[PDB]
């Protein structure tokens, strides 16, 4: 599977930006673009050897972990640290079979009891997304945490917090130029901070956005989708145009 590398050590706005653009460019073929928004590969019929991309993360601590992302939804399904690999609990048999193809030379494989959806991770972590800081400092911490789970050094709530940091700074940032932007701003200003409601509500709505755009009537939505501004106020989007700067990838819905 293709491997895309990022290191927090000496990270800049340009090196993060280029990383996210490489992830996007390896997730999609670029042949399928609707409303100027690229569509990810269709799960149905997708050959196993095209199913996954790997993201190798390194940090100042000189530790490395490799995440596996499903090309069908850009989301993290598991990771490797050294000679151990760890997978979220698959939703079904076919996804269970699919993950057997990842990290196959590793000596210890484990499937967690819990899936990798946010509600489950936030419970394990004992913190919601709105209370977990993101930025290059958090990501450096999170890479160490996932590495030291393989040694016994990381406890479950820290591991779950660290998944939440990685999924937002990698998967969600690939899905949304707006979220890639939030991370670029944190790196620019050397800040760490939690996401605001606008970010959280977009993450929660990605699947529904994908469907509203792809089943739209030449860009016009059959019904509105509610999002949230940074101050938490709600508002409605009625068509694709205002989302083209915001959403970078969509899950495949229809031909």
């Amino acid at each position: 599977y293709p491997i895309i590398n990022f290191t927090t050590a000496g990270a800049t706005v340009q090196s993060y930006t280029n990383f996210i653009r490489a992830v996007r460019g390896r997730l999609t073929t670029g042949a399928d673009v609707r409303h100027e928004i690229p569509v990810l590969p269709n799960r149905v019929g997708l050959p196993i050897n095209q199913r996954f991309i790997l993201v190798e993360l390194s940090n100042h601590a000189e530790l490395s972990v490799t995440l596996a992302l499903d090309v069908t939804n850009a989301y993290v399904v598991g990771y490797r640290a050294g000679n151990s690999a760890y997978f979220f609990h698959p939703d079904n048999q076919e996804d269970a079979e699919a993950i057997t193809h990842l990290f196959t030379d590793v000596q210890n494989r484990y499937t967690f009891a819990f899936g990798g959806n946010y509600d489950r991770l936030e419970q394990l972590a004992g913190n919601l997304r709105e209370n977990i800081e993101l930025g290059n400092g958090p990501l450096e911490e999170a890479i160490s945490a996932l590495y030291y789970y393989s040694t016994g050094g990381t406890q479950l709530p820290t591991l779950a917090r660290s998944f939440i940091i990685c999924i937002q700074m990698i998967s969600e940032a690939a899905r949304f130029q707006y979220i890639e932007g939030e991370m670029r701003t944190r790196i620019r200003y050397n800040r760490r901070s939690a996401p605001d409601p606008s970010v959280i509500t977009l993450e929660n709505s990605w699947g529904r956005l994908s469907t509203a755009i792809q089943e739209s009537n030449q860009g016009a939505f059959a019904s509105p989708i509610q999002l949230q501004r940074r101050n938490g106020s709600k508002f409605s989007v009625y068509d694709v145009s205002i989302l083209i700067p915001i959403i970078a990838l969509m899950v495949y819905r229809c031909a």
Partner: peptide, 6 residues
Amino acid sequence: GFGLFD
């Protein structure tokens, strides 16, 4: 284009 959230 990120103005919609401000």
